[PDB]
Design a protein around this ligand. Structure first.
Ligand SMILES: CC(C)S[C@@H]1O[C@H](CO)[C@H](O)[C@H](O)[C@H]1O
Ligand SMILES: CC(C)S[C@@H]1O[C@H](CO)[C@H](O)[C@H](O)[C@H]1O
Ligand SMILES: CC(C)S[C@@H]1O[C@H](CO)[C@H](O)[C@H](O)[C@H]1O
Ligand SMILES: CC(C)S[C@@H]1O[C@H](CO)[C@H](O)[C@H](O)[C@H]1O
Ligand code: EMC
Ligand code: EMC
Ligand code: EMC
Ligand code: EMC
Lengths: 296, 296, 296, 296
């Protein structure tokens, strides 16, 4: 019935795909409908052209799941010709209709957790700094780390992908920076970091703890199971469809809304390794590896 | 410029999102437009609805990446009415315009890799048999297993997700059926499967070997890196868009088309009952220790 | 005398700086004058404003050293209101006044060299694909690689920086992709590639061969020295000033001018032939290191 | 908005090209425009000729990034005819508006680092002595060098390029003089010095240690990475543009602003006679050892 138009950022990432899917899930309940358009991933203009396409579609309202800086947020919004526009990837400080997850709680649950566990040397692996959310999370980790008087020994950013956690986390360790813990921007890059740690002959949990962010499906699995900050994209899905519907149907709601968020503890977190293999230990292993090579 | 309508499976699953993203990219370079509609895992009617919603938006042509039984594929093509449709998930035998990967080489490369390593006790983990592709790959492991004189000790089916791979493998092992290798319908279920092996105290590769399907993004980065049958969805993307346009210009090929496939061997595969390592493995172990010494 | 305007790509890069300094040498001998205007690396528009800045500069002639995709080349041409326009970073096939190097030869001398030593596993490190020249050279590697029935085991692209060469090469190796040789699209990136290779306890030339493109001032005396495709920028400059003067002097110069390009053999290229040593021998070597490690 | 004229020395050297780039980024932000004019190594007159060219180019203000002794600096300024001018390559004691980095810090930091390591045999590779910065640094090396009772066994002067560092160093070594640490006027030369050192069986860091100046882009990719005094050219570009527009406004500043300098420690430095060690060394051996093993 009520045609919904969604400007979504690359569905290649799991969160968006799970969000769009939720949107479709709820829409079907209200007998509504969703038509999806994928922003070219390049800021306002790309975002704006998508919306323009959506309007030409007979779109009743719009849900804009795409990372928009303030200035660009009001713009795209101003572009939505009297059509109710709800934004899912902005700042809770933007004067537009939005529903977003608590970025304060999320960044808090993570630090507090790692601290309550005894981690001192912690590293940050942020999402691309082009994204609102990423920067908003990097900020949280800084507000609460210093609150607990902690200073990140290393910080760096990927692009939300597994291979990025692997790229960044490999480069770091090489630099001889080995935190006892890592606070990651999302689960995917987290999978990447857990991949780079084992690659480095370290254990996850046991040597270097990793906290994700999102709780995208696959994460209950992952080896070992990823402790992360769950964001219910089923909630963000219904809440936003419903709101967009109200907004559509003159039910003035206007502002920004913040969603719960939570800490799902699993196995990538233990705290923190006191020891490390000594030259003696490495030489030993090397001995038998030598022997084995000899045998060949 | 023009409009390409894609009717796609749940974008919650990674191959669907990667195909659609690839579709978007080729379209991007040719100035076309992509508008995606999503179908409820129900079949024909659910798929028909989506075709309709797209037809109600010009849509120069449709790309239908939704599994359809040969009979329901015809029925669905018949509803596009004068609009060119290209099916990406059907049997290579349905009288429609299709582009599907070689399931015969996929399944053969899987079985031949396992058997040649020496695996006798092999279990199959198939996707929902409500999916043609699932059925195709399943029936294919049978063809090639049978002709290598092998019979699977276990045959199980999930639903494309990582949890299903986990819950199936788990209850398989807990039933006393423990294979030395597993052939899985997709990379996500491969992950859920690895997850369970290790959950039961076994080693992936050394103890239960695992073979995925797709080589979706995150499969490397898995611990250990997933060995798998790679299905270039970047190819599926451009090939799909180009031909779709040819269709909307009378320059159609009209028939079914087969895309290649290849075994990306990584580290979830090993000879059974292996005592003592191999050359490459000694290098891997060595390099880890080296990285471990570097940080010294 | 004659005020010459150079709208140039990033001076931070070496080639552009050498081309601009070369230009200045001629200008000073032919009593000309040069005014450089930098482009902000944003395609046609960014490129146009520069031209606009130059024309408004009483520019008696224009040399556009900026990668301009054919449509945009003609477009910037149109922008050159009544002033001869000589382009330097375009394709061989665009009806405009261009003086460009022969990429067919550059790509061929490179590929033919690496294939002659016995390399089979060759990876590419293209420049940014938004560049015409990056795209021409990349193509040639293909056109010739296939000729000698060889296909890259990797392909990637950087941004013309030594860091992107490092990062991208480091990334290719970090994922187990390790060819016998590399074809790099410029020497700045060649530097990082060498740095990355070494950084991975790998030997340049001996283990991984590298072939850069350009021959900037530093390549001779890089470590080891770099065998690279020679593009004479002292020639480019003189040809541009001379022809720009003539072209404004009334002379009928008109079209494209393909400049030579050769191969500079130095110390970053050797034949492949791997020599394994004995499991006994290597084993012993390891045991050595073991003691060396235990001592520390 | 307004237009900034830049009189730059050869854009063939990296520091200059980097400074200009930084200037452009800043202006861009403040909406200012930039027209570049290149100077010949001739001095006073060539520079004056540059300035007059720009005055004729309208120009709201000029940034003079060219080398001038006190007298030439004052001549050049007087040639600027009222238009605000800022000098970046002068003596911090010249009565003109400038912003030069601190050479006292660079030279002190340099010699202290080599003595802390225990070096006794320190040679000096100064820049062209026509350069106030080149002379200042050489003098600086001499103040803290003699201040530390140490006397340079050798002292030579190149000309800012890699090939001249090589030349002077090959000469030095060739004459029998073979230090154990070297202080070089800039990194390009440092590279050449490092090339010569390898050219002669010697090793950088281990055998002949090397310290450069500038920390220009490519320096962290040199093999081995270069230890060097980092001059922040972004800080130098924005502080200069800001100051020029301000200076333009008639808002006082008048004197000179000494910018900070620091020492980036990398892998071209080591204490003299080293009694065998290095975790990365052994680790590097392991990495190379681990490769023959893989191929075993
Ligand atoms: C509602 C979003 C801000 S969640 C956000 O989306 C990103 C894509 O833009 C990535 O997938 C991040 O991992 C995810 O946390
Ligand atoms: C062309 C398709 C059969 S790819 C197929 O899609 C499925 C969804 O139906 C799953 O995601 C599988 O992993 C994937 O291989
Ligand atoms: C005139 C070009 C083809 S030379 C080209 O310029 C690029 C920047 O534009 C990079 O510097 C490359 O290394 C160089 O080959
Ligand atoms: C602001 C300057 C003193 S930087 C100075 O410029 C020189 C050219 O004049 C060389 O490029 C040196 O490497 C650099 O230190
Ligand atoms: C808490 C979800 Hg293999
Ligand atoms: C197959 C795109 Hg740790
Ligand atoms: C090609 C001769 Hg530091
Ligand atoms: C940052 C030490 Hg190509």
């Amino acid at each position: 019935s009520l045609l919904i138009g969604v400007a979504t950022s690359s569905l290649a990432l799991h969160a968006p795909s799970q969000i769009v899917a939720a949107i479709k899930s709820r829409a079907d309940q209200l007998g509504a409908s969703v038509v999806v358009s994928m922003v070219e991933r390049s800021g306002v203009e790309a975002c704006k052209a998508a919306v323009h396409n959506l309007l030409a579609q007979r779109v009743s309202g719009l849900i804009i799941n795409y990372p928009l800086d303030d200035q660009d947020a009001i713009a795209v919004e101003a572009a939505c010709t009297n059509v109710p526009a709800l934004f899912l990837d902005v700042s809770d400080q933007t004067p537009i209709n939005s529903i977003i997850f608590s970025h304060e709680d999320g960044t808090r649950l993570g630090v507090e957790h790692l601290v309550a566990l005894g981690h001192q040397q912690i590293a940050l692996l942020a999402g691309p700094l082009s994204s609102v959310s990423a920067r908003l999370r990097l900020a949280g980790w800084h507000k609460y780390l210093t609150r607990n008087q902690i200073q990140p020994i290393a910080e760096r950013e990927g692009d939300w992908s597994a291979m990025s956690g692997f790229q960044q986390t490999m480069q770091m360790l090489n630099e001889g920076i080995v935190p006892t813990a890592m606070l990651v921007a999302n689960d995917q890059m987290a999978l990447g970091a857990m991949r780079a740690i084992t690659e480095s002959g370290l254990r996850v949990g046991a040597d270097i703890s990793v906290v994700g962010y999102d709780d995208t499906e696959d994460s209950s699995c992952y080896i070992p199971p990823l402790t992360t900050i769950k964001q219910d994209f089923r909630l963000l899905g219904q809440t936003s469809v419903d709101r967009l519907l109200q907004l559509s149907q003159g039910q003035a709601v206007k502002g920004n809304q913040l969603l719960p968020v939570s800490l799902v503890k699993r196995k990538t977190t233990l705290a923190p390794n006191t020891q490390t293999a000594s030259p003696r230990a490495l030489a030993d292993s090397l001995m038998q590896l030598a022997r084995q090579v000899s045998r060949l």
